Amino acid sequence: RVLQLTLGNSTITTQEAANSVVAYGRWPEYLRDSEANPVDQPTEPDVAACRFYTLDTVSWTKESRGWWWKLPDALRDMGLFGQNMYYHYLGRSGYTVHVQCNASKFHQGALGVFAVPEMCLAGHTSYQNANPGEKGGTFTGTFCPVDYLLGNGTLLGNAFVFPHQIINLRTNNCATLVLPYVNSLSIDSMVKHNNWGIAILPLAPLNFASESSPEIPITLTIAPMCCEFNGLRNITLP
Amino acid sequence: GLPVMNTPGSNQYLTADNFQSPCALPEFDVTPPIDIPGEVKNMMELAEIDTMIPFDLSATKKNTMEMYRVRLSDKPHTDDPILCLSLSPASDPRLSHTMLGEILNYYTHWAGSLKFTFLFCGSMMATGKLLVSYAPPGADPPKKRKEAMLGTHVIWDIGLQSSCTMVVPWISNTTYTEGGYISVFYQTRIVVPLSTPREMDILGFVSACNDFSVRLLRDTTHI
Amino acid sequence: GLPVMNTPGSNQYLTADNFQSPCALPEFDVTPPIDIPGEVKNMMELAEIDTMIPFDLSAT
Amino acid sequence: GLPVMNTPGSNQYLTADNFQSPCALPEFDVTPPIDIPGEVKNMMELAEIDTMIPFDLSATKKNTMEMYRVRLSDKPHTDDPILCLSLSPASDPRLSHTMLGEILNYYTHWAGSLKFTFLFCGSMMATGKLLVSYAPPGADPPKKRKEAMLGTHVIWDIGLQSSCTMVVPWISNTTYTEGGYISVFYQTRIVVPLSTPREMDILGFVSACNDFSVRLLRDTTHI
Amino acid sequence: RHVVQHRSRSESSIESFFARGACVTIMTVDNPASTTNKDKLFAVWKITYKDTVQLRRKLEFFTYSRFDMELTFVVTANFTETNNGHALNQVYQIMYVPPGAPVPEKWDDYTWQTSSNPSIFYTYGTAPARISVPYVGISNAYSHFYDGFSKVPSLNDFGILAVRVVNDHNPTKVTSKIRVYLKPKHIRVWCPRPPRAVAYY
Amino acid sequence: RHVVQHRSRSESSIESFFARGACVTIMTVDNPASTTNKDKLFAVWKITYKDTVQLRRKLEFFTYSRFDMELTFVVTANFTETNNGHALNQVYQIMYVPPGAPVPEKWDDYTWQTSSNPSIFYTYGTAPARISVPYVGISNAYSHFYDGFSKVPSLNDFGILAVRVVNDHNPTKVTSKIRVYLKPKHIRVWCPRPPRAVAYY
User: Fold this and answer.
1) What family is it from (chain C) (predicted)?
2) Do F191 and B31 touch (CB under 8 A)?
3) Are E177 and F170 in contact (CB under 8 A)?
4) Which of A76, F59, F76, F188 sits a CA distance of 20 to 30 A from F19?
């Protein structure tokens, strides 16, 4: 079984969506009428920008400590989503983060893919520093935040309270996280404020047979879902 | 007016009071709530989440990423257990700082079951067997594979299932070493096909069950 | 508010009081009772038991 | 009598109290009210009234009658806007002291739409076109007529309609420059028939809509 | 910060806008010690909104008004001297003289005993005193602006508050201040007007 | 000790876990004696959970929250000096400044009289004062963690508590401390997180 998914002009291949997690069991959804207002006015461009965007692949090695991305930050140079994210002032969007990872049967290791709401990292006081964009940042084992603390002084073993998946190479080699819009507000600035944060840390480290490929690829494919923004909506009276 | 008689406990402030109070902003209209995803209605919901056990709290492994990985390797057939974890989720420095243990530290009494879940993170080609033994409370832990087998155990075939779950039932408050043990032994040594590494890692996760119960809050958090 | 008139016997503590009181552990769930055998509902139940008389209370 | 237990908050005076009180003139019969015309039931009723914007707060125009008149004239075709008004009704010295702004100064949070209304006060013979542009929040104001046209705008033909109304929707509390802009550009220069003056004046009026909402009173008025 | 808000105008109502407790005066009285005492033995204040700019401005938004008046008296005393002051708990007479009625001129004036004038007798240390005067206007609404004259060749009476201490021959001088907290209630207003500046306030 | 226990999770509820009175500050004020007095004449405290580790930790278990706030003021005074201190019972103004409103800067500041700011007038010796502030958040939940910045080239306002003594010219200096006991009420929480250590607390 091999499921080929098309969004817009963009096509990806998934071995199977057999174990695809939905954070808090809540699927992405537009701003409902009970929480909307015809005078605080949204529009829905979930036509074109809401497609699969595939970041530049990262290379998992024996020495890799982890990687992280912020959202909608990572997609701030990604075509129409990045355009809308700057043209519009207020926006909301869920995501579908499909972390594929390509390894042989003679590689071994495990990744913990964690989706974090309000992933405030720390050695933080800098926008460019806290928002690396498309390439994301990396963790450490001692700026760059600490592996076992997630940066936020926080034992990684408890990280599984967050929405997550485990990519254990002997079993599954891909993970999917369906993230709804999570914020204290129904809608907010995308450029000033990242709602979600992806963090991929090797729980079990990479290892492999003698002369296998030394560094395997982890690929992220992020699809905005139910992307909606403001709000140019003017009434001209006679 | 109405004749009344002030009783004892009048004009005292009991911090555990639950009375009415006059609002300071009665005319204020409160910002109405939204349906933020991820609402928690009980702290046990957080203890019910499987969180990784920090097995190896050695002087060097502790407060690192390596404190979570029990390494399997190739070495002489000593039936010493791979791990022997005591089931004191409140006072055991391994289970203590799990989410379960973090919540249990807030309470004085608690009871229920704990599901442990060992996850093998080796090769798809690796093959072998482990013995996951459960020693009930009052019984000292088994030291050899035979003692473990003659008790309560699960023979976990690595090549067939990558994880093994074990629900221990008789977990209750320490006071205010008992509780039992979950041990892991080599039944067989691990078999690899080729130059495949002979050094794997098993992770471990723990959680309370839905049945689990806590009571009498004991926040003891100072500086 | 409601006009009231404090009467005599206000703000006194009579040890034989029987009023309500604020609980210090309202959120605590009490360990529920079991059916222990041998429940006594009245002290006379103990007086109703035949107990041996010490007749000879001599010096020895 | 009735056993009672005085609680905390007894014998305090909270200025926001809402209790009963003993009347000092119970036997007095109050002069009964009449139906005076013009009863207000909500202060927003006053913010809903279109009140003239003092555009030109220059050192000389301010606190005069000329601070309300945007003068159109004949001069080189510079696409600089006739006016560019920022939509900070609470903190913008132009909109600040409008009736809307005066009421908004009494509150901490507010949201709704503002209808602006420009009124041409030139000749019945004058003819021309103006471009009334709306820049949403987060967008810096347009500096040229093309930038304005490619955005949200209304081409107002003076000879056909003497006023132009524009309802801006995303107005909300500052904190505790954003909000957007209403700009006016010359699309065409103004055409007059004869010795008719080539110096007109446009007035501007602002009001909240029925939807508009305020909350958390913040009277800050001292000496 | 930029939050979606539904329609909500409850706090812009006339009651929510006006019915808010606010100090309108600070009366002062000294204990009737026959030491050097003047004027001091009793305080008088004609009730008026024109002495506090917040209430004045909020009202002068309108032309006509009607409202009841919840007065609340916060008394605060202390010994005037370094003297080791010992004083049994004092009682304060807080008299409300209705509109168009004689004012006290002395501590021992006849008005203090008059049955007409409702008086509170407030024991120091107890909860702050409170009364609710109704709409005591002669006309059918309090007029903040009155284009017109008394005689052909503006002001409206809410009452007076007088205060004294009842304790008679005190050895130690005890100074006292009574903060009057006015709270309009059941407010109706008519014929809105522009607000003034904060200029002549 | 090892007792059979039936299912019981009531005390692990969010309300049972959080809605527990706990001191969040100890404000201090000295009586307005014109002797040597500084700063001292009035206290101010911005309401915050980040100054007490117990509440902070319990909240930082989660990302977002909503709760009302039952504040309870336990006042305790005494004479600062060996002086044979005689002082008539003092009154304390306990003002709650709502979010985004001016703070007092002086004892005689205009804010103390402002109608906006609800104030308790507490007579010493009486039962501890109490008010219940509602959810005063601008957003739809108090955010303990906010990944984001103010400007593109964490903190939420619960209000301020100011305190002063109303009694004016006191001869003897009376120091006073007001322990504020906060009790969250009607607590809702969202998006659990791991607890921190007790390290940076």
Assistant:
1) Belongs to the picornaviruses polyprotein family.
2) no
3) no
4) F76
Tally of domains in chain D? 1
A146 DSSP 8-state letter: B
Residues of F with Cβ-Cβ distance to C31 under 8 angstroms: 3, 5
Q: Please give the structure tokens belonging to residue C47.
A: 């007086």
- Do E128 and D13 lie within an 8 Å CB cutoff? yes
How many interface pairs between B and F have CB atoms less than 8 angstroms apart? Answer: 138
**DSSP per-residue codes, chain B:** -EEEEEPTT-S---TT------BS-SSPPPPPP---S-EESBTHHHHTS-EE------TTTTTSSGGG-EEE---------SEEEE--SSS-TTTTTSHHHHHHTTEEEEEEEEEEEEEE-S-SS-B-EEEEEEEPTTSPPP-SHHHHHTSEEEEEETTT-SEEEEEEEEEE------S-EEEEEESS--B-SSS--S-EEEEEEEEE-TT-EEEEE------
Residues in chain B within 8 Å Cβ distance of A147: 64-65
Residue A130 makes CB contacts below 8 A (sequence gap 6+) with A70, A121, A124, F147, F149
CB contact D215 to B (< 8 Å): yes
Chain C residue with minimal CA distance to B107? Answer: C28
Residue E86, both tokens: 């010992």
* Ordered structural domains, chain F, with CATH: 1-201 (2.60.120.20)
For residue B193, cis peptide bond before it (omega within 30 degrees of 0): no
Cα(E6)–Cα(D211) distance, integer angstroms: 9
The answer to whether B171 touches B89, Cβ cutoff 8 Å, is yes
Spell out which residues of chain F touch residue D9, defining contact as CB-CB under 8 Å: 127-131
Query: Do A39 and D111 count as a contact with CB atoms less than 8 A apart?
Result: yes
What fold characterizes domain A1-238?
Answer: Jelly Rolls (2.60.120)
Decide: D44 and E12 in contact? Cβ < 8 Å. Answer: yes
Are the C-beta atoms of E49 and E56 separated by less than 8 Å?
yes
SS3 letters across chain C: CCCEEECCCCCCCCCCCCCCCCCCCCCCCCCCCCCCCCCCCCCHHHHCCCCCCCCCCCCC
Answer for the pair D52, E194: CB distance below 8 angstroms, yes or no.
no
Helix (H) or strand (E) holding F145: none
Residue B114's CB is within 10 A of a number of other CB atoms, namely 24
The beta-carbon neighbor of B6 closest among C6, C26, C27 is C6
The 3-class SS string of chain D reads CEEECCCCCCCCEECCCCCCCCECCCCCCCCCCCCCCCEECECHHHHCCCEECCCCCCCCCCCCCHHHCEEECCCCCCCCCCEEEECCCCCCCCCCCCHHHHHHCCEEEEEEEEEEEEEECCCCCCECEEEEEEECCCCCCCCCHHHHHCCEEEEEECCCCCEEEEEEEEEECCCCCCCCEEEEEECCCCECCCCCCCCEEEEEEEEECCCCEEEEECCCCCC
- Domain boundaries along the sequence of chain A: 1-238
CA A140 remoteness from chain centre:
20
List own/partner pairs for B94-98 with CB under 8 A and 24 or more apart: B94/B53, B94/B54, B94/B55, B94/B57, B95/B53, B95/B206, B97/A155, B97/A157, B97/A158, B97/B54, B98/A157, B98/A158, B98/B51, B98/B52, B98/B53, B98/B206
Domain range for B143 is 1-223
CATH for D25? 2.60.120.20
Burial of B117-129, coded b for 16+ CB within 10 Å and e otherwise, reads bbbbbbbbbbbbb
